[PDB]
Amino acid sequence: SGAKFRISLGLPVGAVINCADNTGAKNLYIISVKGIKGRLNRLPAAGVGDMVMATVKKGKPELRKKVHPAVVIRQRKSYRRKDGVFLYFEDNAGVIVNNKGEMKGSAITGPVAKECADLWPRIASNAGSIA
Amino acid sequence: MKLNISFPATGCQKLIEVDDERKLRTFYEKRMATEVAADALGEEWKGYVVRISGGNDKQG
Amino acid sequence: MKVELCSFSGYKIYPGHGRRYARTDGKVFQFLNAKCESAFLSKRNPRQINWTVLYRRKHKKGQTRRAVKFQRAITGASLADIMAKRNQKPEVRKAQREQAIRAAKEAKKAKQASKK
Amino acid sequence: DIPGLTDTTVPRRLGPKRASRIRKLFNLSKEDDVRQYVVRKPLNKEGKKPRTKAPKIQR
Amino acid sequence: NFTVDQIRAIMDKKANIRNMSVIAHVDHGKSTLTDSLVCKAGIIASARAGETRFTDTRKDEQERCITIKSTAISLFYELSENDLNFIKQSKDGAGFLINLIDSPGHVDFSSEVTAALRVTDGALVVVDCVSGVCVQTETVLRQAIAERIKPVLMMNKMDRALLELQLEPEEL
Amino acid sequence: STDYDLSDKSINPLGGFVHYGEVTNDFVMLKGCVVGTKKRVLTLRKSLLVQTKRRALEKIDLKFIDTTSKFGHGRFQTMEEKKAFMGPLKKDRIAKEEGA
RNA sequence: AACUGCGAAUGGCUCAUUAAAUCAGUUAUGGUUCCUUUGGUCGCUCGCCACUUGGAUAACUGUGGUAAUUCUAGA
RNA sequence: AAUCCUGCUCAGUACGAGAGGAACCGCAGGUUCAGACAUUUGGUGUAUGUGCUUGGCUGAGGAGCCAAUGGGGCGAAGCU
Ligand SMILES: [Mg+2]
Ligand SMILES: [Mg+2]
Ligand SMILES: [Mg+2]
Ligand SMILES: [Mg+2]
Ligand SMILES: [Mg+2]
Ligand SMILES: [Mg+2]
Ligand SMILES: [Mg+2]
Ligand SMILES: [Mg+2]
Ligand SMILES: [Mg+2]
């Protein structure tokens, strides 16, 4: 099918990113990245399209003290798109998802990286636009 | 690319569908209400001068 | 030889050169290098930066109609007949006006006869 | 001349309806049979008796 | 693709109604056969083959591709006079009505099978030619013959036998 | 000059290779980066391995070769394009004035 | 069918906002505006078409575009 | 001195009453590590390269300078 190419991650554990869905959460606090085997002292990091585990800091109180799956959809680090285009966004943002791949919300604010959209079709259908 | 041609002296404006960017580049990057040579529309159309009057986008 | 891009300053951006930037409001720009990018980020209007294409165009650095008198036919008529009629003889036209004058004279006589 | 476009000219759809328009067209100087010099369209069709009618000239 | 009036006009007939249900063990092509019949005939059914037809009335039915709730569809069609010749039963017109019921094939839904069979008068039992007679076919056959249902048998998935199994005609 | 560029230009960038000079003789284009500084002698050897994978057997057809100035952020591919873009300058105009 | 004119600012619904605000009585507009009705006034001013002018533009004939809308262009 | 994993196909297939549910060949990529490299992105930047600017100084202009690198924008090469 063609897996995603390696892209600059830039968002380690502890990053606070905006929450681009409409669930009511303002932001997300990345605590880990799925699929990271790691190294000594090397913080796990995620790029656009990676599934992470994050807890919301500002938002609806019925979600604050809980761990949720998420997917990064916009990153501020510039990454090469295998055609010389170094793309970087205005903000770090991600939507809240579940284990299967469904998106918790129903709308996405702002654009979505093409890699993230191609990885997760549900986010691709919910996306307002594709960068 | 459909190309409607209108002759003021005769009417019966016709659609010419074309498949050659090479023969459309003489119109490309120009604007409307300008006179450009229709000589790239073949030697049959050699000696023809045309002006762009209107156009339709790819969405209509 | 990809699609040709253009920076905000207007220069042609070749593939593999520069950097493309996307905003939250959906707008996507491309920059030839960090100088152009930093000007854009600091929100300097390109029309005052002397070396940009917009400046050159604004300060004009580096820098007829047709009237036709066609003549066609009229629906339900003859193209030859209409030109011939409009180029008819002036003596024919004056004969026409005098014969219509005497036609009006006999119309007046008919009016008088019906009055009587 | 390309076939179709530069040939078989259709006439103008209607005749002029203003008195000055028709007089200018026919080069009339001073009231030379303007009553009958107007265009009279003949209407013909299969299932009727074809006739002819002329517009009303104004001004 | 007919309207409701001729549907009533043939519904009032009694010698051309065929209440029958498709029954089989799990994964024997009941859904696929019913969808092929929906393509071929139908009172309003088109020839749409977008995976599973109206017999999967539920989104989770399309999610799993397992039939959950039994679906009652309607079929109408015609057959020639020499095709009527074989019909030794009562005969009225070339048109026929099929009150098709697609029953679930799982052991846990044998109650839904019973609900279908009480309505129906005949059963199309689907049997995989590769696997032969399976446990749930052995079950639903008992149910139908206890409910006095005529069985008509259909071996399915013959492509698997003749290509995947490479069975020669003698053993086939 | 590929089969899609057709530009009458040489592999030498605008203003010449940095720290090396002007390529005039033949040359070999290699995917990626090889060892050593500029103007360093390199030995090129036919492979000790049997190339049978798709990457090794992949046919290559270049569409475009960058020839902008490597001596900074180059933005013009050739002198002809740079002149067509910038247009005449003060030095050109005064050289025209001096030489008529 | 269309241009033009007129109406579409009325009617109907609801009581959210709203506490000298709305509103009732009363008083002023000699501090203003007013399609429509009616009545006035419309040769009062000395000034090569007037037996009446110019360009068009609809509607209309025709080539379409778009997935789409009471969308529209080109001649 | 290489290491391990994932996605697709196989295949909703073998197996199995069902629920579920692989593997070999192959394809596309990743993790960790290694050895390089600077075309591109980023970092540095005293090229003290070019503008801008504060205080003071050379009578003013022009041209400069000092403030332990005055500060700041952009920055070639090199290194990364
Ligand atoms: Mg540690
Ligand atoms: Mg009148
Ligand atoms: Mg360089
Ligand atoms: Mg070791
Ligand atoms: Mg000073
Ligand atoms: Mg000075
Ligand atoms: Mg001193
Ligand atoms: Mg000191
Ligand atoms: Mg810098």
Given a contact cutoff of 8 angstroms between Cβ atoms, the answer to whether E149 and E122 are in contact is yes
Given a contact cutoff of 8 angstroms between Cβ atoms, the answer to whether D7 and B10 are in contact is yes
Angle, CA B13 vertex, CA B10 and CA B15 arms, to 5°: 150
Amino acid A24 CA to nucleotide G14 C1' distance, rounded Å? 34
Q: Which token pair is F8?
A: 């009458």
E110 has binding-site annotation: no
**b/e code D20-48 from CB counts within 10 Å (16+ = b):** eebbebbebeeebeeeebbbeeeeeeeee
Which residue reads 């003549």 in tokens?
C71
Contacts of A82 in chain C (CB under 8 A): none
Q: Helix (H, G, I), strand (E, B), or coil: what is residue C93? A: helix
Q: How far is the CA of F13 from the centre of ligand 3 (A)?
A: 11
Q: Which residues contact C98 (CB under 8 A, 6 or more apart)?
A: none
**Maximum C-alpha span of chain E:** 51
E106 has binding-site annotation: no
F77-81's contacts with Cβ under 8 Å and 24+ in sequence apart are F77/C14, F77/F7, F77/F9, F77/F14, F78/F7, F78/F9, F78/F14, F79/F14
**What method did the depositors use to determine the structure?**
cryo-EM
Q: State how beta strands E17-23 and E122-128 pair.
A: parallel
Given a contact cutoff of 8 angstroms between Cβ atoms, the answer to whether C75 and D44 are in contact is no
Which residue reads 């000239």 in tokens?
D57
**b/e code E83-106 from CB counts within 10 Å (16+ = b):** eeeeeeeeeeeeebbbbbbbbbbe
DSSP type of residue A49? T
Contacts of B9 in chain C (CB under 8 A): 70, 72
* C70 min Cα distance to partner chain B (Å): 7
From the list F38, F46, F2, F36, the residue with the least C-alpha distance to F18 is: F38
Per the CB < 8 Å rule, is C76 touching D41?
yes
Per the CB < 8 Å rule, is B13 touching D5?
yes
Given a contact cutoff of 8 angstroms between Cβ atoms, the answer to whether A52 and A71 are in contact is yes
d(CA B35, CA B27): 10
Resolution rounded to one decimal, in angstroms: 3.1
Contacts of A110 in chain C (CB under 8 A): 24-26
**Closest Cβ opposite residue A84 in set C15, C22, C25:** C15
Q: How far is the CA of A45 from the centre of ligand 1 (A)?
A: 16
Q: Which residues contact F81 (CB under 8 A, 6 or more apart)?
A: none
Q: What is the DSSP string of chain E?
A: ---HHHHHHHHT-SSSEEEEEEE-SSSSSHHHHHHHHHHH--SS-----SSS-TT--SHHHHHH----S-EEEEEEEE--HHHHTT--S----SEEEEEEEE---SGGGHHHHHHHHHH-SEEEEEEETTTBS-HHHHHHHHHHHHTT-EEEEEEE-HHIIIIIS---TTT-
Phi, psi of F97 (to 5 degrees): -65, -40
CB pairs under 8 A between C and D: 46
Q: Is the CB of D35 under 7 A from strand G?
A: no
Amino acid C31 CA to nucleotide H62 C1' distance, rounded Å? 38
H strand bases under 7 Å from protein CB:
5-8, 12-14, 16-20, 27-33, 36-43, 73-79
Q: What is the DSSP string of A60-110?
A: -HHHHTS-EEEEEEE-SS-EE-SSS-EEE-SS-EEEEB-SSS-BSSS---S
Q: Is the CB of B1 under 7 A from strand G?
A: no
Q: How far is the CA of F4 from the centre of ligand 3 (A)?
A: 27
Q: How many CB atoms lie within 10 A of CB A88?
A: 18
d(CA A2, CA E113): 44
Phi, psi of E18 (to 5 degrees): -135, 90
Angle, CA B48 vertex, CA B47 and CA B53 arms, to 5°: 160
Given a contact cutoff of 8 angstroms between Cβ atoms, the answer to whether B10 and C70 are in contact is no
| B 9-48: CB within 7 Å of strand G | 11-15
Cα dihedral C72, C78, C81, C86, rounded to 10, equals -40
Q: Which token pair is B47?
A: 């000696």
Q: Which token pair is A128?
A: 């307002």
Q: Helix (H, G, I), strand (E, B), or coil: what is residue F94? A: helix
- Give the full edge-to-edge strand order of the sheet including C19-22: A79-80, A86-88, C19-22, C28-31
Q: How far is the CA of F35 from the centre of ligand 4 (A)?
A: 24
Distance of alpha carbon E44 from the chain centroid: 17
Query: Does residue C67 sit at the B interface (CB-CB below 8 Å)?
Result: no
**Closest Cβ opposite residue A89 in set C16, C18, C22:** C22
Q: Is the CB of B56 under 7 A from strand G?
A: yes
E158 has binding-site annotation: yes
**b/e code E142-168 from CB counts within 10 Å (16+ = b):** ebbeeeebeeeeeebbeeebeeeeeee
- Please provide the distance, in angstroms rounded to a whole number, between the alpha carbons at the two ends of chain B: 13
Q: Which token pair is E156?
A: 């399915």
